Every structure is written in C-alpha cells, then in structure tokens.
Amino acid sequence: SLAEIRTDFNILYSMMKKHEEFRWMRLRIRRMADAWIQAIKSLAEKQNLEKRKRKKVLVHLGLLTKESGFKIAETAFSGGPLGELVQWSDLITSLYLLGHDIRISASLAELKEIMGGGGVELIYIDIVGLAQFKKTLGPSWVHYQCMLRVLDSFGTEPEFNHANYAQSKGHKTPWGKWNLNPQQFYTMFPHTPDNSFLGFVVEQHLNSSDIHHINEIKRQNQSLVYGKVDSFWKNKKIYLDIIHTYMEVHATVYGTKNIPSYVKNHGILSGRDLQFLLRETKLFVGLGFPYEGPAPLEAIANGCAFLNPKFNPPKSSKNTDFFIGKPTLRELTSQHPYAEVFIGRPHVWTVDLNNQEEVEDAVKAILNQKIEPYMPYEFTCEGMLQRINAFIEKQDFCHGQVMWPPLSALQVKLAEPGQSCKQVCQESQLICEPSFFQHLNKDKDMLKYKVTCQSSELAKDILVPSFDPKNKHCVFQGDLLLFSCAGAHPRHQRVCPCRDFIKGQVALCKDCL
Numbered sequence: 001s002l003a004e005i006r007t008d009f010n011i012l013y014s015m016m017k018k019h020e021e022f023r024w025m026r027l028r029i030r031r032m033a034d035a036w037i038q039a040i041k042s043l044a045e046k047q048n049l050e051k052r053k054r055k056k057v058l059v060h061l062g063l064l065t066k067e068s069g070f071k072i073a074e075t076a077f078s079g080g081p082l083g084e085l086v087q088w089s090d091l092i093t094s095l096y097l098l099g100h101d102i103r104i105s106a107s108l109a110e111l112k113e114i115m116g117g118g119g120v121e122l123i124y125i126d127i128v129g130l131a132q133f134k135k136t137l138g139p140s141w142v143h144y145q146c147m148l149r150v151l152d153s154f155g156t157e158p159e160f161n162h163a164n165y166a167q168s169k170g171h172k173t174p175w176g177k178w179n180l181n182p183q184q185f186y187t188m189f190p191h192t193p194d195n196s197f198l199g200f201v202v203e204q205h206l207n208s209s210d211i212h213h214i215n216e217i218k219r220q221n222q223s224l225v226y227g228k229v230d231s232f233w234k235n236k237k238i239y240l241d242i243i244h245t246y247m248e249v250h251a252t253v254y255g256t257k258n259i260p261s262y263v264k265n266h267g268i269l270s271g272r273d274l275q276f277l278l279r280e281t282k283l284f285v286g287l288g289f290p291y292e293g294p295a296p297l298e299a300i301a302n303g304c305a306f307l308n309p310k311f312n313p314p315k316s317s318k319n320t321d322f323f324i325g326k327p328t329l330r331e332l333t334s335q336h337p338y339a340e341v342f343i344g345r346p347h348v349w350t351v352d353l354n355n356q357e358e359v360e361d362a363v364k365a366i367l368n369q370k371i372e373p374y375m376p377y378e379f380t381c382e383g384m385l386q387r388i389n390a391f392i393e394k395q396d397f398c399h400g401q402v403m404w405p406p407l408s409a410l411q412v413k414l415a416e417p418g419q420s421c422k423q424v425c426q427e428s429q430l431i432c433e434p435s436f437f438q439h440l441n442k443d444k445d446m447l448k449y450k451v452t453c454q455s456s457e458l459a460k461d462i463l464v465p466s467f468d469p470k471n472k473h474c475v476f477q478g479d480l481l482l483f484s485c486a487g488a489h490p491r492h493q494r495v496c497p498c499r500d501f502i503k504g505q506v507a508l509c510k511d512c513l
C-alpha cells in the first residue's frame, strides 16, 4: 500500500506496447530513460519520498481514441503535432518512477473497465477525454470530478469554466463550461495562475564534455528555422534574408514555395537526429507560429539562442484566428512568452520581426555570444518529478487533506485599476494563488491586510473582491467559482492573493514540499 520508487522501465515498456498509438511516447521515454532514473534516485536522496500511499491512477489519453478522430499517432513520425504527446510521455514516466499504479487508457472500453474496477484515486485526462468520461460513466461522473487533473495546454480562465457566467458574458465558445475548480486544469507553461502548471521535460543529450567543448561542437554560423509546416513560412522572406546575411539557414520542413532557395532542408528528423542538429546549431529561428511549444526549450537546452518574434499588439482572441473560441482571454507578448520572461537574454532574443535593424543586431549579437546550454529546473526530470509528486501528495480538491498551499504563504497585494491579480503578483516577483481568495472575501478579513470597508456589497463577478479607496467601498464575491487571478478592474483596486515560489519551480511555494 506504500509507493516505492521504480528504477527500471521494463514494466512501463510492457504497458506501452499494448497500444500501437503509444509507439512515439515509448521511443521518447527510451531515449530519456538514463536521465529519468538518475533523477528519481537524486530526488529520493534529497527529499522525503518515504511513506507515500501508492495511488491507483487512471491516465485517459482522449487525443489517441479512435472516437476523437485526431490521427495524432498517424502524423507523430511525419511532422504532425507532438506537444501533447511530449507532456503525456513525461507525465506517465513521472507517475511510474514515483511508484504509482498507472492504468493507461486510449479507448472508451478501457476507460469504462478501469473506472468499473474501482479503487481509482486520481485521474489524468485531456479535454476530449473529459467529454468521453462524462458520456461513458453517465451522471455519477461528478462523483469523481474532484480526482480529475485536466491536461489543458493553453489554460482555462474562471470566466469560461463557469458555464452560466460564460453564457451571461456572451462567450459563444464550445470550450470551458466544466464548472471544475480551475486549479484542476494542468497547463503546458506557467501562463495561467488560475490553473496548475504541469509542463514536461526538455530532452537534451549533452554529456559533461559536450557542454564544456560546446564552442568547438557548434557551427557558429548555422541557424535552424522553427517551423515544420510550409504555411508557417508565409511572408518571412525579408526576416530570413537578414539572418541569411550572417548565417546558413537550415530547416526541418515536410512536403514548398514559402521556403527560399538558399534554405538547407533536412526534412522531418527523428528525435535523435533533431537533437544532433540542435547540438550543431548556433541560432534557432522563430517565425511567429506555433505558440508556446516545447521545440524552443530543446534548442536552448542544446546551447542554441532562440530568436523569439515579439507581438505588438500581444496576440489573443481579440486579434488572432487561432485564439478565437479558446476558453481564455490571455494575451501572448511573443511566440514563446515563457522563453521571453523566464529565460530572456542571452538565450532568448525577443525581437520585432518587422524591425530589420533590431533583427540584424540580435543576429550579430548572437554570433558574438558564448554558448551556455540552459534548462530551467522546472523542465528537468528532477524538477518535473518534484512538481508532480508535490501535486499528488498535497493537492486535494476532495476535502480529505490539510489546506495547500499553506495560509503562511499568502502575501496580499492591491492591483491598481487596469491591473489583474496575475500582473500585480508577477511584478512583485510573486504568483497569484487563487486558493487564497476565500480568505480575502469579507470586512473582518480585509482589516488584516490594512484595507478598511466603510460599505460593502456582494457581486458575482471575476473582478471581486474589489476596493474603491476613494469611497472606502468593498465588493465581495457572491459566487466562489468566479474567483479569478485573470481580469483587471477598470475603476477599482483588486484585492489579490499572491504567494512566493521556489526559484525555477513556480508551481510550488517555498513551504509547499
């Protein structure tokens, strides 16, 4: 009944052989196996993994069901989308190494059998899979809703999750409306503090001697374009011509008349051959699309600089077809906001693609830069293992455990008008902690944080609790499902729950382990 760390992948390989659909994830795990095993042993030596209850975990890969009809396994080796399979691979591996009892499903039949078998304590599922869960189980699916952890790359904001409020606000999207605790949504990058950051591991294969003699390994004038689809290259000729002035321009593109004649195409590469190419490459070139993928972090892990297209105005539902109907109003300041804000120079140059001088200076700067391979701790094997272990042991929506994060981590901030709780926490080098809103939502609570309510009313709005400092009037939350880090009050101040984070591990407060 106690979890024991696993240091051998034989049982896992055996589980993943039972579906052809898993082939790409099995090959990824096999390439990263030595790094994973080093990591679970290191975590267990540093940090108490003893006396954890072994959980029966349902892992339902909705994106791999026939019923979903996505053909993601079918395109996995021919340049189709891999972001979601990267994350699923690293989640399954983490659960397995931590010694949990994983039951993998990629069919309605398996979903129903596993849930039928009882004893399920935890459910990892995607958005397509969640619809299938509700349909397969029927009305008692809600009996399990607190055990759901919903892999949702781009995030779901409270205003979209609340079905009745989303309708009241005229949101016409099919997405959202699950009425979950929004911390139950597991994102690819830590961009949505209303949600939990799951992430993944950045694959690299530089041994200690590679990292040291990286200046001698790298072709100093080799650039590689990020963009495995020809359409991504539309209207990039002037940009690429500026880079071609200084560097060879390599590509990994399928099929192409958006691609200048001078570009050295390798076509779609296997994982190992891509990694070898990144090891050789000085500059990884963003075209603007796709948004918030793993590929740039792979380049940075291999000592490549990332040229990150800046978006002014920021891209969102208000101006970008891709974002219309997504259950979020979040704006992207660049192709890879994580790379921009949490890594930055010298590894990431965030440049206006249109500004020829800024692009030319970035390329010339990057050529003159010393290579330092870098991975943020949260995207290492040991980082992800620490994060998902903390979530499994500590994160409880079923009212069975102590409060987490602990109240001790609460730092109240007042957001100005036009400023969200996400923004005011961030610019204090903190992060919004939506589990703390419940402590900021009445007169006697506001006194503790030096806010004085002469008058107060209740509103069912994402923008409250709010404070008019001019009138000393407080608006409190009437619908607890509408507590939201996202959203700026145009008139009043927001009362905002912030927490600290372990540096390089934003998911976790300093006292959260």
Ligand SMILES: O=c1ccn([C@@H]2O[C@H](COP(=O)(O)OP(=O)(O)O)[C@@H](O)[C@H]2O)c(=O)[nH]1
Pocket: 080, 081, 082, 083, 084, 086, 228, 252, 267, 268, 269, 270, 271, 274, 290, 293, 294, 295, 296, 298
């Ligand atoms: O020729 C290639 C180009 C990319 N990739 C991989 O594709 C994965 C997904 O990265 P991307 O950011 O392109 O995300 P996607 O759009 O597939 O979700 C990364 O692990 C890359 O290593 C690959 O295997 N071969």
Ligand SMILES: *[C@@H]1O[C@H](CO)[C@@H](O)[C@H](O)[C@H]1NC(C)=O
Pocket: 221, 244, 245, 246, 247, 248
């Ligand atoms: C890059 O470097 C190679 C080898 O030093 C050189 O022959 C080539 O002309 C360079 N190409 C560009 C576009 O700068």
